[PDB]
């Protein structure tokens, strides 16, 4: 069971909203994330104009649908929007979904009533991200076309001016795309069209009014080198960095040499300055190799052409396995599942280990089925094999199982563990993933939502 | 016996396990990242959408949406799908945004110097990152690989060796550098076997990583580069009995400020590279020909310490440095009457002063011009046709004159000769006021009432030169009181004296960030108290930018920037750092008027009111040919307005009677970047960064451009810092280099010599807990 | 060059 992947089990087209009669198309999608366990998962799907709210139930019906639409928003202002991320009401606990767009203002609503909270000033430009803090559900960050990052606060005691701090001074000099928090609230990824990636860490923010924001000059981490093309993605995977550029057709899996999310956060002066104007990399925490980063892994996503503008996630759980999930501007969805790759190594050693010790005379038994490694051995008086490895073995089969699993070059291309084809022309903008793993949701052009799911009900 | 292909086959085989290494590590840093999966937090004790059913539809809005079911592993849809409608709820929201803009706009207290940039063949960029990254990747195999090998000769240091005697260094190095390598590692490479060998290595490395068929190759020489030993030597960060002292006080004459008198600030030259020129000493001829001149003039010419003193009285052998510390505050005491070594240097070192002094014994007359005269201070005749002083828009900068002679043409007087016309010799050039008679000497104006005015029986020479008045020469005016920014909300003081100090003073009129009253314009300046005609506004601040830095931000922002010293060629620009009068938008019916101003050797813009304008009106200049296309030609309140105002950082809305807001001057970020500087200088030893940082951060933060102050900041500053400076022998005598250097320049009164001496003892003794 | 919009 736990080595399933998703299948496509539903999809939808939303009316077209932006009128031509279909270039709109969903930009977001965010799972509610507050929920408690067990819940039915609800997500926002995020047009130019409109919040589309559904709860996914799981069906013993093959031909039942699974998505119900609760609630749809329009945003009765001129802005379009492509960013949106879930907080909460500070007193009442209420789901609050946060949606911005090319006017640079955060609209605040309350889903469950149809009303308005809020709305944040304040930014000079379009915005393109929102993300919201893992350690404070009151914090959120966005990154605008003003080349700055806003972190806000919609705690009680921040409601006259909720502007926490600003991420300025010459990091970034063109539009931002993504922005993406550390697990423990502290550290900020930034990117976009100048082709810099930016690593940010945040002070403590009093729990008291503040007249001004506190503002941060400085990125402790900055590199321009990892991609050679703008960066419209970013995020973390523990204190690991993923990251995809325009025209490259990757994500990349990369670190910074020496950060530790384990380490004391370091403070605003601590932050390197640009002294010299050829260094394109810059870093607080180098202590191995003489560099600053390493790139580790390419995971491979062929046919994005020139697209940007489209985002990949993880699904990273307690207990579960991790998956990286990424359609591309080719009407694709692809899936890795990052345990394969030990699995895959373990086998692969137990098969050279036994070769060596039998003088290349072993044998091979898939695993998952009712037999053990102990019966197979009362048998001939033998190595076990992955069953999702699919073809001694032949050449072409140990070369299929390699561009998939190995993970021996840093710049090979790791192709996907699954490919999902979409029917029609589809661009991804977005994925997301429920609480419990078992949806998976891709969004894009042509205000289509795509329904994956595994672990599924459905009986005859 | 090794051939190129034996060694060339080794590491083939050594090779194998990068990729092996590259698996491992990969696979253990996803496990660990698996195992410390967070935890979902905040989540809410009930599911807040568990009452909300579906809004399918069985005068409101209302939008379709279309589903269709899929099963199988392909995908397959069950049928064409099913369509429903839904009721819209509509939102609006219920404030605008602010005006557009781009970056952050921080303020600054005064003009800040920029580097050169670089503008980021595509080709070339891509490929030297992929060969960057794969010799990082085989830099820490080099040495274990080499003992593995344990070839005679083939040694990471003989490899570096054998690098710098081959021919691609003559392309790759430059003379000087190749002797700051054979300094480390000379060019004995061993017996013949060694070197054979060491040469056979570096043939087969190329011949294995450095195929040119493939992209991701280094050659062996790009491994060695990295080396902690050999990278500093191409790194051209650096900054560098009277010739023991010249060298002493080599770190303080080079970088040594003669305007705000810190060691990395605003002033100076940046080179195309972003070398540095600073405003130094050594750009008006070093220690010597200022200090020749302080001991000339001493010789045309109390109380003894608590230090067991020499002049009541009068051991641990002495070190190099200490003897070294007594030479030159020797030599740079001078032949004084009132100061001597003894106690200062009793009270550097820790010993008694009775030690140390025990230690110790062990003008061609000039025709003056017809068109200035220096002793009336008084222009006269045809002297807007005889000199540029007064047009900056038109001068070039040389450094101030510090040649023998007289300042004429003959003696190569940059003053006298380098320009079109002669120029006044100003307060850093070597000659005095009685030799030479281009000498400024400051205005003559004295008044119970106002003075040093635009519209004054005899003008202001220095509102008739385009300068401010300076503290120390305009003795009459009070410019001494005026231009000292602790006093710059004395209103009193300010109501009478010199008027021609403002940008000095620092103080700014109250002004409120708002919208534009103009269509098509965004953000306006507005007046938030009422100001006269004449009155001074705001100064125009921001990045000073030469020529082709420029064009590079013009091009790179698909841009406004204030010319200062157009034939010089420095434009200011506050696209980032600058202050609220980058707002001001332009109308050619103005209301305040900008105009280019000499202040103490720096050139600043001021803003001045040429109508009456009242509280809440907005500000308007005519922008004129002050931003030129460089690619092409190549209690205070928020005032009642009809616009939104808004706080410049907050961006929040102002509203009509609140106190108006008024946020200090955040600078850390400045100071951090100015102590950086610093500390990336390779020939600076790290107890001279450490005392060179501790001033600077103090003395930055006090923007000194006149000598008139910098005795009371040096005395707060050895007050602050006394603990401090007698904790660790090496911050007194770094200490004792600066006041050295200041004494050599006469800039340093010998009484505040003394003072500090008795600071000193002080913290000595209180430290004897 | 990079293009936002679908194609
Ligand atoms: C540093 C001085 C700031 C200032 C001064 C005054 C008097 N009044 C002001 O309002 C502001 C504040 N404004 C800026 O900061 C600023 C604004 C604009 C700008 C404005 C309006 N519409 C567009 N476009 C139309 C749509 N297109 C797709 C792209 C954009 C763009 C472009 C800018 C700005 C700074 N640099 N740039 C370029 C060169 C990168
Ligand atoms: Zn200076
Ligand atoms: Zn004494
Ligand atoms: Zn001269
Ligand atoms: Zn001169
Ligand atoms: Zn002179
Ligand atoms: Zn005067
Ligand atoms: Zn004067
Ligand atoms: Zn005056």
Do not use: C, D, K
């Given at each position: 069971a736990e080595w399933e992947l998703p299948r496509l089990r539903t999809s939808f087209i939303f009316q077209d909203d932006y009128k031509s009669q279909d270039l709109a198309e969903f930009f977001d999608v965010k799972f509610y994330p507050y929920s408690p366990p067990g819940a039915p998962p609800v997500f926002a799907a995020t047009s130019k104009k409109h919040a589309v709210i559904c709860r996914l139930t799981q069906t013993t019906d093959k031909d039942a649908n699974p998505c119900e639409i609760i609630q749809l928003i329009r945003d009765d202002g001129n802005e379009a929007n492509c960013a949106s991320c879930w907080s909460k009401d500070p007193i009442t606990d209420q789901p609050l979904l946060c949606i911005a767009g090319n006017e640079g203002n955060v609209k605040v609503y309350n889903v469950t009533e149809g009303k308005l909270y809020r709305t944040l000033v304040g930014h000079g430009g379009g915005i393109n991200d929102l993300a919201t803090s893992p350690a404070n559900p009151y914090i959120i960050a966005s990154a605008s076309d003003d080349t700055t990052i806003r972190i806000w606060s919609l705690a009680p005691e921040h409601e006259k001016q909720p502007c926490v701090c600003i991420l300025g001074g010459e990091g970034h000099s063109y539009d931002l795309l993504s922005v993406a928090f550390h697990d423990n609230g502290r550290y900020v990824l930034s990117a976009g069209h100048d082709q810099v990636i930016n690593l940010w860490a945040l002070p403590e923010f009093p729990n008291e009014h503040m007249e001004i924001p506190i503002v941060i000059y400085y990125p402790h981490f900055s590199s321009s080198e990892i991609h050679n093309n703008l960066v419209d993605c970013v995020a973390f995977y523990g204190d690991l960095i993923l990251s995809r550029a325009c025209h490259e057709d990757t994500i990349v899996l990369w670190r910074i040499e020496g950060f530790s999310s384990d380490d004391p956060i370091p403070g605003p002066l601590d932050a390197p300055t640009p002294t010299d104007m050829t260094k394109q990399t810059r870093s607080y925490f180098t202590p191995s190799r003489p560099a600053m980063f390493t790139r580790l892994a390419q995971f491979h996503t062929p046919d994005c052409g020139v697209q940007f503008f489209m985002r990949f996630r993880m699904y990273h759980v307690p207990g579960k396995h991790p998956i990286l999930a990424f359609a591309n501007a080719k009407s694709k969805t692809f899936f890795w599942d990052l345990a394969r790759f030990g699995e895959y190594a373990r086998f692969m050693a137990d098969l050279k280990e036994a070769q060596q010790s039998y003088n290349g005379r072993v044998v091979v038994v898939d695993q998952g089925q009712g037999i053990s490694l102990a019966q197979a051995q009362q048998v001939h008086g033998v190595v076990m094999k992955p069953?999702?490895?699919?073809?001694?073995?032949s050449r072409e089969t140990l070369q299929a199982w390699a561009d998939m699993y190995d993970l021996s070059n840093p710049v090979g291309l790791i192709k996907a563990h699954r490919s999902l084809a979409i029917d029609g022309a589809f661009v991804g903008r977005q994925v997301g993933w429920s609480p419990e793993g078992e949806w998976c949701v891709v969004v894009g052009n042509g205000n289509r939502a795509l329904i994956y799911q595994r672990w599924g009900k459905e009986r005859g | 016996e090794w051939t190129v292909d034996k060694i060339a086959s080794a590491l083939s085989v050594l090779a194998e396990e990068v990729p092996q290494n590259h698996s491992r590590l990969v696979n253990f840093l996803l496990e660990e990242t698996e195992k410390r999966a967070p935890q979902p937090r905040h989540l809410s004790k009930t599911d807040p959408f568990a009452h909300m059913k579906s809004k399918a539809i069985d005068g409101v809005p209302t939008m379709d949406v279309k589903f269709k079911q899929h099963s199988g592993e392909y995908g397959k849809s069950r049928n064409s799908g099913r369509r429903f409608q839904y009721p819209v709820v509509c939102i609006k929201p219920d404030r605008e945004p602010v005006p557009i803009y781009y970056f952050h706009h921080a303020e600054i207290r005064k003009n800040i110097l920029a580097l050169n940039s670089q503008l980021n063949p595509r080709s070339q960029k891509i490929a030297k990152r992929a060969q960057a990254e794969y010799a990082a990747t085989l830099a820490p195999y080099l040495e274990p690989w080499l003992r593995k090998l344990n070839i005679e000769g083939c040694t990471k240091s003989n490899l570096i060796r054998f690098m710098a005697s081959q021919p691609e260094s003559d392309d790759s190095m430059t003379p000087q550098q190749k002797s700051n390598l054979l300094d480390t590692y000379s060019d004995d490479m061993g017996s013949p076997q060694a070197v054979r060998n060491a040469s056979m290595f570096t043939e087969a490395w190329d011949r294995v990583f450095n195929d040119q068929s493939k992209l991701r190759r280094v050659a062996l020489r790009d491994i060695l580069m990295l080396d902690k030993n050999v990278e500093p030597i191409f790194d051209n960060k650096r900054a560098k009995l009277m010739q023991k002292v010249i060298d002493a006080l080599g770190s303080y004459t080079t970088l040594g400020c003669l305007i705000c008198f810190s060691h990395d600030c605003e002033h100076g030259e940046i080179e195309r590279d972003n070398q540095k020129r600073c405003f130094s000493l050594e750009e008006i001829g070093g220690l010597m020909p200022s200090l020749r001149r302080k001991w000339a003039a001493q010789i045309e010419q109390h109380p003894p310490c608590r230090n067991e003193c020499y002049r009541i009285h009068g051991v641990p052998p002495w070190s190099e440095n200490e003897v070294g510390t007594l030479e030159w505050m020797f030599a740079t005491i001078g032949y004084s009457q009132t100061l001597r070594p003894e106690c200062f240097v009793g009270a550097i070192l820790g010993r008694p002063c009775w030690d140390v002094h025990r230690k110790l014994q062990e003008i061609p007359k000039q025709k003056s011009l017809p068109w200035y005269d220096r002793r009336k201070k008084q222009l006269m005749s045809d002297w807007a046709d005889a000199?540029?002083?007064?047009?900056?828009?038109?001068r070039e900068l040389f450094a101030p004159c510090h040649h023998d002679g007289p300042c004429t043409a003959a003696n190569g007087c940059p003053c006298a000769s380098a320009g079109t016309h002669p120029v006044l010799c100003e307060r850093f050039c070597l000659c005095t006021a009685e030799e030479c008679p281009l000498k400024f000497t400051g205005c003559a104006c004295h008044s119970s009432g106002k003075t040093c005015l635009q519209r004054q029986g005899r003008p202001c020479i220095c509102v008739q030169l385009n300068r401010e008045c300076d503290p120390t020469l305009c003795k009459g005016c009070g410019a001494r009181e005026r231009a000292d920014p602790e006093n710059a909300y004395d209103e009193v003081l300010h109501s009478t004296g010199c008027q021609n100090v403002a940008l000095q003073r620092g103080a700014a009129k109250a002004v409120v960030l708002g919208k534009s009253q103009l269509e098509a314009c965004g953000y306006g300046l507005f007046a938030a108290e009422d100001i006269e005609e004449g009155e001074f506004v705001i100064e125009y601040t921001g990045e000073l930018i030469s020529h082709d830095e420029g064009v590079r931000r013009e091009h790179r922002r698909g841009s406004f920037l204030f010319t200062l010293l157009e034939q010089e060629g420095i434009w200011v620009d506050?696209?980032?750092?600058?202050?609220?009068?980058?707002?001001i938008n332009h109308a050619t019916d103005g209301n305040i008027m900008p105009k280019i101003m000499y202040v103490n050797h720096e050139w600043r813009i001021k803003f001045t009111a040429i109508k009456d304008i009242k509280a809440g009106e907005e500000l308007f200049f005519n922008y004129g040919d002050n931003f030129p296309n460089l690619t092409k030609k190549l209690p205070l309140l928020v005032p009642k307005t009809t616009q939104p105002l808004f706080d410049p950082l907050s961006k929040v809305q102002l509203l009509p009677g609140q106190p108006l807001p008024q946020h200090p001057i955040d600078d850390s970020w400045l100071l951090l970047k100015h102590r950086d500087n610093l500390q990336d200088f390779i020939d600076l030893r790290p107890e001279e960064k450490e005392f060179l940082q501790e001033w600077d951060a103090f003395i930055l933060r006090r923007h000194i451009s006149s000598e008139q102050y910098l005795p009371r900041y040096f005395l707060r500053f050895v007050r602050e810092k006394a603990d401090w400076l007698v904790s660790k022998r090496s911050r007194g005598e770094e200490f004792s280099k600066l006041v050295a250097t200041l004494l050599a320049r006469r800039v340093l009164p010998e009484r505040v010599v003394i003072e500090a001496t008795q600071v000193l003892n002080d913290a000595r003794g209180r430290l004897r807990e | 060059a990079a293009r936002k919009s679908a194609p």
């Open positions: 069953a999702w490895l699919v073809p001694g073995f | 000199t540029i002083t007064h047009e900056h828009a038109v506050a696209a980032i750092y600058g202050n609220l009068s980058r707002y | -």
